[PDB]
Write a protein that binds this ligand. Sequence first.
Ligand code: LBV
Ligand code: LBV
Lengths: 506, 504
Amino acid sequence: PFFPPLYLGGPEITTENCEREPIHIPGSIQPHGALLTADGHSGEVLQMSLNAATFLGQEPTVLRGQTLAALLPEQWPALQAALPPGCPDALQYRATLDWPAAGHLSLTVHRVGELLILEFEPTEHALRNAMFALESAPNLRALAEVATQTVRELTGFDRVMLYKFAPDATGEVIAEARREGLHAFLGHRFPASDIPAQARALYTRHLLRLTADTRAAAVPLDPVLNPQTNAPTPLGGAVLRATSPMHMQYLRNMGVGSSLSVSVVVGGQLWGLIACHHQTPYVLPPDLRTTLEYLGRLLSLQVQVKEAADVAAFRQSLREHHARVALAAAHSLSPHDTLSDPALDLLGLMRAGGLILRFEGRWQTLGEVPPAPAVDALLAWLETQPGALVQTDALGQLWPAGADLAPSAAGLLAISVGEGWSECLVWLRPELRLEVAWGGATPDQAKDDLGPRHSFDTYLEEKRGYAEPWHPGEIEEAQDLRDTLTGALGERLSVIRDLNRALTQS
Amino acid sequence: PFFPPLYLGGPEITTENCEREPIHIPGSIQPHGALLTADGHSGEVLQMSLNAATFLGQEPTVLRGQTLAALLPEQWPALQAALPPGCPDALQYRATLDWPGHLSLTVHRVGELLILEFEPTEHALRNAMFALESAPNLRALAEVATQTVRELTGFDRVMLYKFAPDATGEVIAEARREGLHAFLGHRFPASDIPAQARALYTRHLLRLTADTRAAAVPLDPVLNPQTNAPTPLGGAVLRATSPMHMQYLRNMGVGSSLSVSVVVGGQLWGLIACHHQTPYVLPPDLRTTLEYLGRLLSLQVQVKEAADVAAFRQSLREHHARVALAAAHSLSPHDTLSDPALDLLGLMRAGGLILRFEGRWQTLGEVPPAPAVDALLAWLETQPGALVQTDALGQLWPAGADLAPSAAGLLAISVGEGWSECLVWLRPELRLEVAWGGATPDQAKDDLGPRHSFDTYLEEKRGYAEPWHPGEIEEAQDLRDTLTGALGERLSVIRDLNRALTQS
Ligand SMILES: C=CC1=C(C)/C(=C/C2=[NH+]C(=C\c3[nH]c(/C=C4\NC(=O)[C@@H](C)\C4=C/C)c(C)c3CCC(=O)O)/C(CCC(=O)O)=C2C)NC1=O
Ligand SMILES: C=CC1=C(C)/C(=C/C2=[NH+]C(=C\c3[nH]c(/C=C4\NC(=O)[C@@H](C)\C4=C/C)c(C)c3CCC(=O)O)/C(CCC(=O)O)=C2C)NC1=O
């Protein structure tokens, strides 16, 4: 639930109440364009940006109280065709204008409810080569390099980087291209507090936003409330939408003049950003932004292709080792024997230190394992767990009672044959020395200050109770075992009923 | 395995030996450009198209025996950067030239060789991209595509052609000129698009025929002297069309062709296929626009299909959720999955059902006679996977072609493995009429060349049923997991029964 905005009457936003900021309703725009709201039926003007009078070059007595039919005679018929009543608010329409007072204008329109938002901005063979270059990258780190070079070339920005999210919403810079004699942010990881959750929800909907100037003063809308609904006007799909005042402070301390980002969306989920900085105030032309929007879409396809090629490659190293195992667990009638032979080796398939088997109603260990009573502690925890696969790199965090059992078991991968964890397998990876290079500060040191942090330098933190993280192609290998074992469970039942049959008869 | 080409010494291609035609090595180009092959290291010219002398406007004594350094001084450095040794042959590079009019040069590398293609040259795409992303369903998306493509290209007919899992295609959307025939809805055999052609159209994603009544222009010398072998022209756009397919478009009465491949998750999904009545040449800078749209579509197909399934499966929400709870605590499936209060016949819109647990079978609804049940089950045990899905049973199993009245359609899942325990939904026989565009699959192997008729043809199909909506197959595979999942509890219990009866 969001707090009301400042103009209506709401509380002051700090680091504590961050999630509850109405970013999508600022009631203000960035001062390098003009904004008009009109009725989606009559064509009568309802709101103006305060700067619109001069930018379009007319007396505001005339603008307030006029039809879109009289202002844009060539466009108003064309506009009503493209955006019919009851259309998604993500749908946009663009056209170019020859306004004599200014010169050349680029008009961008979209519909929200019974309302039209109008955005005005001044305006005036490599993309084909770039598209073909992305499709012929070998791996993923190769694809991310081609992206950053290509974007820096077109835009002429100081720094361009590809920023990728983890499943816990802390991001990592995976590739970077910059000007010479500058700091390097590559490899650095960042907390889940820099990008709030409602902002992540927005960046899945609309796929581009920017800040032309970080030291700019915002321009209000008049009248401030939409008189149709007597409510604040939603500016989510508007590009001239003023930036959140909190984030503006952040870019000042990092010492940035201008920002831009394009969202990468894989299968209806936010995957990462392409984030650009410049040292000085800098305005990108609107016809160049369009090129960036195509590249965002091309990437969103090629991310899928390269990731699925990385897994298939890895899993072709473990081919014969997989195939002999799969044959041995498909004819097993006693798993406590066939899955314990060192001649098969289940420790090497997963590159694990130890293993805990559990079938029938007992348990048996291979390799390097915790002491005996501590095994029964671990298993007791797994029975409460929801799914059919539990995967962790740090065990001490998920389970604090087993934070002392790091030397043998820091890492864990567990699969449940059948359901309920009556029967399972558990691979164990030992403790490792870990050093994570945080860009700025650790997650605990992001909630101390009333505003953003000052330091953005390379920070080293020693993490304890961590292990070697699981390659995704190994998790895919495990889930294929989990199927074979659960599959041949039917034969096991079959037999025992026939045993039961005799012993009922006796 | 392919036959050798005509110039080396191979057999004449007919309808019998179609799969064995070397399409990717014709040794000829379409006469509206020029083609040069050069060494990828020295830059020395090795092959010319016979028409190249005049098109580029030079004496062929000069062209043969020259460097690319002397011909394109501004390009030769730039070209060696873009295409390094050992790069995929799908990678392309383009640039524009001011030849005393204007030329568009397109280059790609195959092995130790460079292919050069020459062609003459001289705000809506942004609107189209946004319109595709805001389409409600799939048939709505396919309509936006066909309108948008007809507008830019100005072609007579544009249509989206989608493949079935058996490689017979169906026209799902269409936009055309007025006073013309309508191909929409018509289905076509798996013999019109051969299999090696399908293999090619997954690699390179555009091809065209500028003129159907054109004579092909040969290459000189005809064999690449580097390898003493025919020069591969797969990635070349000026590549001459197969002579068989040229005959086909003449009988359909087409002047010019173009197609763009739609590729979903490393598989061919469909084509965008365009015709014109007269010879017509598309400019190269307009083709580039079409190539972007092909890529945009290939993403949006995925989004709209996954939205169609999720929509359907939200109608069957409570009916699914009650069932899933009942088969997760079952200790006797022969009881809990037989109550009409649960109803498994309605979840799948089926006429009948055959259950099988323990070691016997029990039926609900409308089912075949008793000895014929044991015929059907005997067949399922030989079947490979864990799900068998068919609309026509008589084709997959000819011994049960007589059991159409009760069981024309089938969907069977195997709890566990081996078909010891399974469930089988049955759909009854239905009157079916399929509108073939031209002729049926049996009437495509008679003639020595292509067919003449392309009119609406009606065939009465017998032994067919209502086909399964994909959201129903997704519903079935989620049951197959619950039943197999709770098999563990079933075993657990019986061992403890066994425990007592061992003790006695
Ligand atoms: C090296 C990589 C890197 C990182 C990790 C990074 C983060 C980052 N923040 C972003 C946005 C926002 N952040 C906050 C708020 C807070 N964030 C904090 O730190 C505290 C003080 C806080 C609240 C108490 C809000 C409200 C917004 C939404 C702004 C709007 O849409 O109006 C964006 C997207 C915008 C863009 O691309 O320029 C990025 C990419 N900036 C970098 O360059
Ligand atoms: C209304 C829908 C409709 C259909 C179904 C249709 C067919 C069709 N076949 C295509 C291609 C080829 N066909 C054949 C050969 C044969 N075709 C036959 O019928 C028999 C005689 C036969 C061999 C025994 C060969 C070698 C090729 C490869 C061409 C090459 O790449 O050189 C293409 C794609 C190319 C394009 O769009 O132009 C289409 C779209 N034309 C339509 O517009």
